[PDB]
Amino acid sequence: WLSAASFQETTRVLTDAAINCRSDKLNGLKENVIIGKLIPAGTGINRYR
Amino acid sequence: ALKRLKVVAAFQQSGNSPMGMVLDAVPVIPPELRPMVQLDGGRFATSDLNDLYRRVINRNNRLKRLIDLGAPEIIVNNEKRMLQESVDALFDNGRRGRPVTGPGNRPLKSLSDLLKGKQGRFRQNLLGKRVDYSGRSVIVVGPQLKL
Amino acid sequence: GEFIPRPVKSSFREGLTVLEYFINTHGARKGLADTALRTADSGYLTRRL
Amino acid sequence: GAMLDVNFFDELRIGLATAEDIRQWSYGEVKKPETINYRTLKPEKDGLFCEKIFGPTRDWECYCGKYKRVRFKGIICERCGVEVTRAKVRRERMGHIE
Amino acid sequence: TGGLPRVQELFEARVPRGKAPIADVTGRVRLEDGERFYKITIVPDDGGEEVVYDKISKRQRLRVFKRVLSDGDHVEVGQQLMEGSADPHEV
Amino acid sequence: EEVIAEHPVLLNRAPTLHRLGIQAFEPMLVEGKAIQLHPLVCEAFNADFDGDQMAVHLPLSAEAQAEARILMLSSNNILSPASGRPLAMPRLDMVTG
Amino acid sequence: SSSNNSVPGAPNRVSFAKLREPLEVPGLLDVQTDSFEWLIGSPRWRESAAERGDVNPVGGLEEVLYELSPIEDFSGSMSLSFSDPRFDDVKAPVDECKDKDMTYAAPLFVTAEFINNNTGEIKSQTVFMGDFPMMTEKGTFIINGTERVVVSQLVRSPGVYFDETIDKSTDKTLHSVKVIPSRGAWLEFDVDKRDTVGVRIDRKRRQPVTVLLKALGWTSEQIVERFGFSEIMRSTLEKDNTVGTDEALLDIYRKLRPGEPPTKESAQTLLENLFFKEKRYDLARVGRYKVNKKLGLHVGEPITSSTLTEEDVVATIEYLVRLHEGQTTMTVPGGVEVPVETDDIDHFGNRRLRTVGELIQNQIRVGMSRMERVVRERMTTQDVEAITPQTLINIRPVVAAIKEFFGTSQLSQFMDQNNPLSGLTHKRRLSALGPGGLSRERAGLEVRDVHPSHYGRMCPIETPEGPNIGLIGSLSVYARVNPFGFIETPYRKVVDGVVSDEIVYLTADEEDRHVVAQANSPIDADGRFVEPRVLVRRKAGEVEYVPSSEVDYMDVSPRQMVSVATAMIPFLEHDDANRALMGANMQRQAVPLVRSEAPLVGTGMELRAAIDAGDVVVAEESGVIEEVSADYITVMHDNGTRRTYRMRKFARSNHGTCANQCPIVDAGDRVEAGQVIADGPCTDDGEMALGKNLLVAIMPWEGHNYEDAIILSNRLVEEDVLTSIHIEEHEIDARDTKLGAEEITRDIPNISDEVLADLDERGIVRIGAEVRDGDILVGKVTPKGREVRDTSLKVPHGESGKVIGIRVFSREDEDELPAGVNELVRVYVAQKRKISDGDKLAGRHGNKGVIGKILPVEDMPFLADGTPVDIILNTHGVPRRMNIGQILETHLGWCAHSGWKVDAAKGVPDWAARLPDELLEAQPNAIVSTPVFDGAQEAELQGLLSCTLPNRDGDVLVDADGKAMLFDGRSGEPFPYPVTVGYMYIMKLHHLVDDKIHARSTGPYSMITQQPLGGKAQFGGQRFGEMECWAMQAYGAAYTLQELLTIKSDDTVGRVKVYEAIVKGENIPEPGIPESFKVLLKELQSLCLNVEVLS
DNA sequence: GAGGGTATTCGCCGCCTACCTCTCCTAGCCCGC
DNA sequence: GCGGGCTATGGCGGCGAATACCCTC
RNA sequence: CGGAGAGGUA
């Protein structure tokens, strides 16, 4: 619900997510960029980092 | 029934009552995130959020006085409607009815406007930043350089 | 978008007359307008992709 | 789960807020439509900028002036009621309107 | 459409524009000629049932597959009868 | 002159349509107030010299410098990721000569 | 042969033109100057209208007053009226206002008479209506000491328009009509896809037309009497399902005023008040004229109405019903014949021009309406026999409206003062975007087009290049605006196949019913075309070969469609439209050079352009110069009177350039009225001079002029050929402050006297001092509660120069200061800028580029005689961009500089047969002119290149092809092949590299989102956007991206720790949590959403 | 008059990036000094 | 009498949902 | 350095 709210239609996404009580398992490029964490790709994968 | 069941199952599966749609209290954002500045000389120009909070507070206090002192049902109902409208405009100004406009006939920036659009929080502050150790200048061709 | 059946009959070495220049300005400007519209249109598609 | 934050994030959850949650977030109530005074250039009380709700406006100081040093750390003012802490607290604390 | 709008509608999986019907079962067709409407009936080789489209406007041409589409001609399962762009959701 | 030795720099031109819009070079001080761009990276940057401008970034930490030196160095990026054709190829005056 | 034989003291610039100009170019500021004297009703406008509009000469203010008055109460027992507006002398001269800060305005008075309708007592007074901003002689307004230009607005003329569309479902051609009023309510009449004519009064339900037809008083008898020949008209009543006059009225009320008693009287009031009274509906004079012209109602009675009428509203229906069918003619009863047809909404007959006068009139009108409401309110709450005109009038709304228009409008624009041409071009702009026009994004590609109706009224070339493409235009050269706002262009009447005199001004609407010919057409002074066929714009701008007996008019000159700036490009017809647009726009960006020099290959539109711009000084009256100095000229008139002109030296323009006037006459010369007596910023002998003549080569060179880069010699720097002066303006004031009182003085604590060496007794720096980046210009201290806090003015980063002037306004000297201040000290610093690497240059043909390198003058290609070239331009840029005009300009510039002599020993050569005398021979450094579309042919250029004079010895350095044999200054060997050389005209654009260089490591930060600030003026940092993030993610570089987004931008502790680590030899710490995520969390919580982070 | 099937119209959502310069943020009116 | 503070009918395409018009029971 | 409007460069 955090990657969809930054793309389009923030109000609708937020209001539906709040009703469905969705939990965000932060795993993605955009989400890790937003929360200031190493992206899971390239030199940020476990075998490399 | 498909859409009705969508919403009803959404509210049934989790321990989330549908009573959160009707509000009894209204949170207030911290002041340093809605600051008020002064133009040249020392004259303060109000922010949009402060004006909407002020309207809601005024309406709430006046309705409270009217109810406490006792009054005909019409006045109390009218004031409750005017409080409902103010609270609606606080969260989302312009969704229903005429936008609450400030000086110069321009709609105010509600709390919802902070999150939406190309100038909203996300696409202006979280997906892009202003970074130190950077500069800018015009480019010219150096033929003696190496790749 | 239709062709002018005249047509323009002088090269830019010789020098176009006044009417030839005026009827050339049409296509000259339509291209720039379309270019602005297209640069506006492409970024949205790239972001969606 | 983690209050402010601090890394080792695992999930970010969202949901509707009940009146109890909204009253628990708030450090006080706003019940006067006054933002700031012009003569003293200070926030009013029970307004939208109150220092007894959102936090001190000067590091380790009180609107009373009773305590204006770090030695008076953590004590809630006995005269004005403003807690003595750093001014950054105004970016965090919230209030509510009943 | 033949440019960036065409790309946008391809990636958006929208109904194209000049949507051309596509057969759903191999069989011959009793092509009919009329103004503002063309009746194309799918006569399957098995003969179970015959699908038909009579709303085809005369403006659009008939696709040339294998000779132009003609009366009483067998067609494949996915052959596009008319000319234009097929709708992705039907293929 | 000693401090800036062997310290890569990131140059960027807007719009950044593709990946090669940011590349890492090595700084050598010159005379003037303009940036001197190697002629073979213009196609990658889609840049010209009729008034264009560019930004400059400096990676600080060891990981950032290693990334600049190995991943983003200009001499290691000669082929287009989209198609594989070379992009540091000679053009215009070089082709004529 | 010469260019300007009318101006008394003009240079003898010879021309290649072959065609005579019947008419002289009008004044280039007449629109702005005339539309305002119409507003104030000056005697000059009255005289102008006498020989034209003597029937009813009324000014804007008079018209507004007459329309407003009389103001009477409901009972009609009293009245108030206005008349005879009057202006007094301006309070201060233009220079005084521009210096102090006052607005250039004069008092306005009106005679107000109050009449009591039951006692007969009449009381009259002269009521002051406020200060009225006045227009300077140059067409500008000084508002708060700043010059401004009120741009003209293109808008859609009010009237009735019919349009056509194709129905997708049934392929039926649905029609429509819309009555567009001024300040009124809309009224549509559609034909939908069921053959049911309907109405959409305002934005209500689609009521059938028969509803309103009957409600107006008609019956089925009359409805079928006039309507009925259309099947749909009768079918409308057949299936109306409603009938009755009162029934119809109550239906209209049900659709108009929901929720109130539907009474017949109330419906009458509502309807005939919305659409017929006087004040809710105003078609206006232009709207009434257009409606009468379209619906063929009257061709007689002078327009004396501004309201709708039954005949018009029924003629609209008749027109629509006839239109839908196939009819192509109608004659409404008691009306002249008129065809049936749709209306093109882009035509220049269907869109008029709102000039400065009309806009100001509209604003005054709204202010007067507010005042009228106030006066009517107060006219019933005050006792009789105590009311006087002064006791009811409140001027506040009018002054407020004037202030708001002149300060907060999209048409009142800051004037452009880069050079003389930019301001003149600004004063002649036509914009479509404004309060009442299109939108910069919602506007389509059909309003950004070149319409055939624009030929001779709007220039098709000079438009912006970005989002405003097609929305801002420029008025043409010979064009004028008529009383109703429709632009007219001159034409030369041709009679019986003879191109005669007596120019007549036409409009687009009128011009659409004639055939006009091309100006550059063959005529033989006998009124008979030499050639058989001539291209002519047939009806809809369709150029066609046509018989010579059909032509009805002729263009005045072959220079009629272009604007002023586009008319200064020589060999314009050899350049493509894109590059011509680039060059026309770039001519307005050139900076004034320290010394100006006129071109050698100009066009001719440079003397009038300079004189009309008004930056030169023109002698008021003829006389003999008495004493001429650098600061003042004194003409001793022919009647014993002396008038001393004062020259403004080293002044500052709105854009930081330097304005400097220099006399060009001697102490014994005799001058004539209208003669140029001094020069301006970009003028040389009274002609525009925006650049310099340089010797150019057209070869590639070592890859330094690669991809539009340029190579310059070092002579242009040593000799100051392209040097310019710029001026900055630093201002600081001392307020009263809540703290209380602040002073400017040398007493700055903690600073030694050494730093304050350049400071003086008062506090300001000494004139003639040198200031560098960081230096006290005005030393002060403010007690922030000693508490004295030094907030002294400093030289901005990257600034330097010399302090050349200081202005200080003191409250003690009863100055016109703002509220709450005491001092307004101001400073000026000026510095000369030489051409450097990174500066932008360009010609007049869209050939732009930055300076790649500045070679030493030793290793430069030099001619056989030893003369180095000045500039080198690459070969690969020309043939691709279709701007070959620069090469022809170079050839002709070489011919002009070298001087020539055609050898007509035995007859003039056939290539010089049509070459005017005085052009068969020239001396070195001769100045010539090639008009924009009628100039030098290629054969003439070849011939002139074939015969040029030797330099000192009998050597011709450039051969017939125009190419010389150069030498390699870097190696010494001669280049294997010859090169093209010559003189072209180069300008220095206002895009210097000193203004575009910026760097940062740390500094000011934002407060809410704790990120660096944006801008070169508060240090600020470059922004790492979203596509750069995509690129960094595609590289697979996680750590650089993380550091960029965390420790360089908004990680408060991280920034300080990183700085402390780098300054020392430590290693960079780990990044933390950004600061823009916590703000988002708080906002989401404030929206009543329980957001939490779960471990 | 309710049902089910069509049409029809209205509201909302979306519409590239980076940088530079310049001017202005209510009106009325009631109380206080 | 003047100043300061308090209050009160020139986008357009896609799409879905809230609702006109007509045959059936 | 917060907002609105105007103009401009790539």
Ligand SMILES: [Mg+2]
């Ligand atoms: Mg460029």
Ligand SMILES: [Zn+2]
């Ligand atoms: Zn206290």
